[PDB]
Amino acid sequence: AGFAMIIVASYTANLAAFLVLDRPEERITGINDPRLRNPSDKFIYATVKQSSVDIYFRRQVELSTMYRHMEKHNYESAAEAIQAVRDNKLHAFIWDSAVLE
Amino acid sequence: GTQERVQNSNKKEWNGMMGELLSGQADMIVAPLTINNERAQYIEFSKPFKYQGLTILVKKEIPRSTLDSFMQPFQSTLWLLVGLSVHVVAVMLYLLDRFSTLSSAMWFSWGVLLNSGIGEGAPRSFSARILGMVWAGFAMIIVASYTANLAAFLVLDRPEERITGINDPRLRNPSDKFIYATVKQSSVDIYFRRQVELSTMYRHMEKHNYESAAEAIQAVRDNKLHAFIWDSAVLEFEASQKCDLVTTGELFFRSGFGIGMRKDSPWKQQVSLSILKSHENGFMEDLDKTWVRYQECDSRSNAPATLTCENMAGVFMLVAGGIVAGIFLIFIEIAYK
Amino acid sequence: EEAPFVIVESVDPLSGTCMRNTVPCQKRIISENKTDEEPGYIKKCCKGFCIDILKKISKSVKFTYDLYLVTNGKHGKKINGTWNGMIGEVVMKRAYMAVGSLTINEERSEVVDFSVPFIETGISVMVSRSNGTVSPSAFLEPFSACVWVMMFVMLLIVSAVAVFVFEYFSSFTIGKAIWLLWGLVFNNSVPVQNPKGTTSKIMVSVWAFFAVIFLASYTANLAAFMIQEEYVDQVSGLSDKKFQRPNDFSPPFRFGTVPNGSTERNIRNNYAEMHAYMGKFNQRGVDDALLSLKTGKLDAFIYDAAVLNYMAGRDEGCKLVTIGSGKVFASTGYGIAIQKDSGWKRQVDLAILQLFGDGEMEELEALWLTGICHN
Amino acid sequence: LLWGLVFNNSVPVQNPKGTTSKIMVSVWAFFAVIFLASYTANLAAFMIQ
Amino acid sequence: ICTGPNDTSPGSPRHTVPQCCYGFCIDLLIKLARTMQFTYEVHLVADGKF
Amino acid sequence: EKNEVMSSQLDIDNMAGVFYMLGAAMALSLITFISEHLFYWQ
Numbered sequence: 016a017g018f019a020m021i022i023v024a025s026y027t028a029n030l031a032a033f034l035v036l037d038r039p040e041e042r043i044t045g046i047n048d049p050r051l052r053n054p055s056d057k058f059i060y061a062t063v064k065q066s067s068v069d070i071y072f073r074r075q076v077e078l079s080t081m082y083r084h085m086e087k088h089n090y091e092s093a094a095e096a097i098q099a100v101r102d103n104k105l106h107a108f109i110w111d112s113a114v115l116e
Numbered sequence: 117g118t119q120e121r122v123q124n125s126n127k128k129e130w131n132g133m134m135g136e137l138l139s140g141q142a143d144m145i146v147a148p149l150t151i152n153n154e155r156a157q158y159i160e161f162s163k164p165f166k167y168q169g170l171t172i173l174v175k176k177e178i179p180r181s182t183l184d185s186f187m188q189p190f191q192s193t194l195w196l197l198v199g200l201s202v203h204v205v206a207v208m209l210y211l212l213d214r215f216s217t218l219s220s221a222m223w224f225s226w227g228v229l230l231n232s233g234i235g236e237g238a239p240r241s242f243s244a245r246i247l248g249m250v251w252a253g254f255a256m257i258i259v260a261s262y263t264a265n266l267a268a269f270l271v272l273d274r275p276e277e278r279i280t281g282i283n284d285p286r287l288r289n290p291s292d293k294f295i296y297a298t299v300k301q302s303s304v305d306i307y308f309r310r311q312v313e314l315s316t317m318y319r320h321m322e323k324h325n326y327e328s329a330a331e332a333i334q335a336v337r338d339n340k341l342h343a344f345i346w347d348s349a350v351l352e353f354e355a356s357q358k359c360d361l362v363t364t365g366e367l368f369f370r371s372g373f374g375i376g377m378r379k380d381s382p383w384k385q386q387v388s389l390s391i392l393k394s395h396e397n398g399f400m401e402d403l404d405k406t407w408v409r410y411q412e413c414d415s416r417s418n419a420p421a422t423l424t425c426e427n428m429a430g431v432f433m434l435v436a437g438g439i440v441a442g443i444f445l446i447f448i449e450i451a452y453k
Numbered sequence: 454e455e456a457p458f459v460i461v462e463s464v465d466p467l468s469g470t471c472m473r474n475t476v477p478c479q480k481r482i483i484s485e486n487k488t489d490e491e492p493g494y495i496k497k498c499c500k501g502f503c504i505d506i507l508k509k510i511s512k513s514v515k516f517t518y519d520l521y522l523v524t525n526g527k528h529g530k531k532i533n534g535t536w537n538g539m540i541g542e543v544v545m546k547r548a549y550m551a552v553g554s555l556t557i558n559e560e561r562s563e564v565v566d567f568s569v570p571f572i573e574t575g576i577s578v579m580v581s582r583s584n585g586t587v588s589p590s591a592f593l594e595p596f597s598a599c600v601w602v603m604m605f606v607m608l609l610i611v612s613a614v615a616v617f618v619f620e621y622f623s624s625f626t627i628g629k630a631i632w633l634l635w636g637l638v639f640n641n642s643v644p645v646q647n648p649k650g651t652t653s654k655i656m657v658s659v660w661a662f663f664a665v666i667f668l669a670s671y672t673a674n675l676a677a678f679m680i681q682e683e684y685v686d687q688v689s690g691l692s693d694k695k696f697q698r699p700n701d702f703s704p705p706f707r708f709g710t711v712p713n714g715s716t717e718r719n720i721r722n723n724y725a726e727m728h729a730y731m732g733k734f735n736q737r738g739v740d741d742a743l744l745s746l747k748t749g750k751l752d753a754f755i756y757d758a759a760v761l762n763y764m765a766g767r768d769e770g771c772k773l774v775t776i777g778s779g780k781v782f783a784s785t786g787y788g789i790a791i792q793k794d795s796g797w798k799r800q801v802d803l804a805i806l807q808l809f810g811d812g813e814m815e816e817l818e819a820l821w822l823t824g825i826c827h828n
Numbered sequence: 829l830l831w832g833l834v835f836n837n838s839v840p841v842q843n844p845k846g847t848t849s850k851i852m853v854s855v856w857a858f859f860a861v862i863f864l865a866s867y868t869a870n871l872a873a874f875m876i877q
Numbered sequence: 878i879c880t881g882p883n884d885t886s887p888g889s890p891r892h893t894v895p896q897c898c899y900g901f902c903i904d905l906l907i908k909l910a911r912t913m914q915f916t917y918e919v920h921l922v923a924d925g926k927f
Numbered sequence: 928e929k930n931e932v933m934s935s936q937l938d939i940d941n942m943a944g945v946f947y948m949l950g951a952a953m954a955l956s957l958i959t960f961i962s963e964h965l966f967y968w969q
């Protein structure tokens with residue numbers, strides 16, 4: 016009987032253990048996630064061409080590197096970018112909050 | 117040993133054991149000496165023979181106990197509520213009995229909750245059997261909730277403190293409740309006074325520095341000083357041996373203890389070569405195991421285990437009280453017979 | 454070239470040179486089959502960590518330079534009384550200053566000099582993430598070491614009160630009694646015989662309450678202690694028998710190391726037999742080692758410290774880990790190699806320590822060597 | 829008996845006698861012991877976070 | 878109302894047709910208008926980029 | 928992103944739900960008894 020109690024208790028315990036440990040990291044942090052300073056050629060950023068964001072980049076000196084990696088993919092407008100990140104053809108999108116929210 | 121001006125003249129000399137070396141009292145510095153620009157100006161350093169960095173040291177936080185047997189999970193009010201509701205449903209059962217076995221019904225309910233196998237009554241009236249099902253359901257619910265929130269109690273740990281390092285803003289705008297400390301005239305002090313930004317904390321640091329290590333250790337053990345800053349390869353061993361203190365995480369500027377010789381003695385390269393060969397043949401590490409990583413107090417502030425007789429009080433006392441409180445009522449009832 | 458320290462990159466196809474924040478890497482490549490007549494100039498540009506430390510030193514002590522890659526081999530192994538690679542080029546052909554990723558040993562220090570090191574490093578191990586846990590005696594773990602027997606004896610006690618009390622008031626044996634009891638504590642999952650005296654009727658229900666507290670407590674504690682487990686790397690250190698006598702086991706480990714490096718030529722002077730055994734694998738490059746470690750072809754890897762710790766914080770997921778808590782087994786450091794006995798040595802040395810005074814090494818570190826995993 | 833079994837066999841009941849049914853119920857008992865453990869585990873989880 | 882180009886990719890010749898706009902700003906616009914007594918006749922942009 | 932509270936002692940604050948379930952059960956049960964009775968003598 017003792018063995019029986021033991022086994023059933025272990026069962027319930029590790030079912031509980033299963034139901035509470037969640038998913039791993041991804042959490043792209045921001046301008047500092049080093050996945051964004053030395054881009055492997057699997058990531059692709061994007062912004063809308065000729066847009067305030069682009070100005071904020073080209074003038075900054077450090078970020079210059081990613082700028083170039085950014086250059087060859089920018090889109091025509093918002094809706095295109097949204098629809099293009101929905102279907103996985105583009106990893107990350109950078110834009111203004113009060114639209115993204 | 118550091119550098120400083122003297123006699124209100126243009127003489128800048130070297131206090132301390134390094135200064136002793138400069139003047140000709142001995143010709144080798146074998147001790148936990150650090151490395152930095154100023155000292156490296158005019159003294160030759162061997163290759164580094166032990167790598168480490170700076171770190172912090174604080175008084176270990178105090179944990180939460182095993183438990184008071186029945187305190188944590190329930191409020192007394194809950195106990196009272198269930199206690200009365202038992203007899204409530206009992207008398208309602210008895211009414212559904214008579215309207216269309218009391219000493220039975222009390223047993224029936226008290227058992228249904230307590231899961232004890234005892235008891236022989238039952239709901240005769242279909243009216244009551246409609247109720248008994250949900251009564252049992254309630255019982256299961258309550259006991260499950262109990263076990264669940266006991267589990268919840270045993271796994272959520274203590275709050276933040278985690279002084280991070282040189283960036284915990286509790287260390288840039290010191291309220292006058294914190295007090296740092298370092299050993300006066302020590303490499304650390306040099307690392308501060310020369311940096312420009314940190315200057316502020318420097319001043320807050322100045323009015324408390326100690327005479328030597330042991331004083332600082334003993335003064336942070338007894339709560340007379342919050343935080344201590346020093347060299348790791350001392351703090352690590354110190355925490356390992358006496359285990360109500362702890363280090364916190366970060367390092368500052370990675371430097372290495374090395375042997376030191378006067379300016380261009382003819383002994384440099386031999387000493388350096390010997391040190392290297394030593395690092396290759398593991399001999400150094402034999403020293404290590406023999407003197408540093410030998411003892412281990414606790415770690416892993418999770419501590420998610422290990423309950424013992426501290427729980428056993430609130431319940432074993434109860435069972436012994438049941439024993440001793442039975443005999444009186446037994447005598448009473450054999451008299452009532 | 455070296456993955457995290459000296460990254461090479463071809464020029465931009467528009468201008469002719471590449472972007473800012475790098476230095477041209479001239480004279481890389483020579484001819485192969487017809488005639489040298491060295492063109493050399495396939496100029497590319499390189500950047501990273503070591504390059505930055507070089508640039509800052511250049512500005513801090515006035516001088517100029519020009520940087521050209523290397524051909525004959527690798528870091529360089531003394532062969533037949535002669536040196537390949539960087540050391541070779543800095544002994545004979547008067548390169549006059551090597552930089553990049555060099556270790557520091559005795560041999561090399563016997564020919565050239567060395568600055569003060571600036572990154573701790575050494576030998577280290579790397580294994581696939583030990584998918585699984587360690588919980589061999591979890592069930593026995595929680596809730597006590599002793600209180601079991603205290604409950605045991607409390608039980609044997611209450612048995613006596615049972616017999617005595619139920620003997621005097623208005624088929625009951627000690628056997629059936631203790632049986633019912635021991636059945637009750639765990640779960641009333643046993644067909645038993647109950648007592649009859651009202652005295653005992655109460656006298657047992659208290660113990661039942663005891664049981665329902667006990668069981669819930671125990672389950673809760675088990676759940677808790679199983680939540681916050683901890684991984685244990687399935688190898689102790691380089692001195693383990695599991696490396697000493699490999700054949701002594703079910704299919705023995707298959708661990709390798711890129712040859713000609715400092716690490717190997719370290720190994721070959723402490724465990725010669727194990728070095729010989731290692732000859733059967735000798736993985737090539739690095740990324741090859743990674744792939745083979747991801748596809749069961751290897752199970753352990755021995756290589757430099759720093760480059761490993763950078764490689765750990767990279768790979769997708771977090772499925773590759775350095776052994777121990779990041780422990781290192783031959784403490785040394787990288788450095789700068791200059792031709793024997795120029796005055797330059799001293800003037801460089803101070804320079805480097807200068808940077809340790811202004812946290813600049815911390816900025817550089819946080820800018821190149823950080824990772825995402827193992828936070 | 830059934831409704832008593834699902835929650836906990838904490839009810840004095842009357843069992844059947846046919847071997848057929850003897851098996852026919854033990855499966856449902858297994859069902860109960862899965863059910864109860866599942867439910868408690870989920871409650872613990874949802875109360876953690 | 879808003880007069881503006883059709884076929885938002887304006888490589889093909891634009892047809893400046895009328896559509897109507899509504900959202901979070903033009904209401905604010907209206908608030909201003911009734912606050913300071915002026916008329917207006919909006920119209921979208923040609924190039925689409927800011 | 929502080930982790931979360933660590934509850935304790937679970938006062939009557941929440942168990943009101945289960946107690947309500949209990950009481951409503953009692954009420955509906957006695958209702959059904961009176962119903963069955965008034966039908967049974969009929």
Ligand SMILES: *[C@@H]1O[C@H](CO)[C@@H](O[C@@H]2O[C@H](CO)[C@@H](O)[C@H](O)[C@H]2NC(C)=O)[C@H](O)[C@H]1NC(C)=O
Pocket residue numbers: 527711712713737738
């Ligand atoms: C380690 O150094 C040896 C030095 O000989 C390398 O062996 C040479 O590689 C070249 C071209 O790959 C061959 O032409 C030689 O015949 C090889 N030498 C011998 C003795 O066979 C070896 O490739 C180096 N290993 C690594 C990983 O670079």
Ligand SMILES: *[C@@H]1O[C@H](CO)[C@@H](O)[C@H](O)[C@H]1NC(C)=O
Pocket residue numbers: 533534
């Ligand atoms: C090694 O010895 C000398 C270099 O000292 C060289 O001339 C000779 O050809 C080499 N032979 C072999 C077998 O490596």
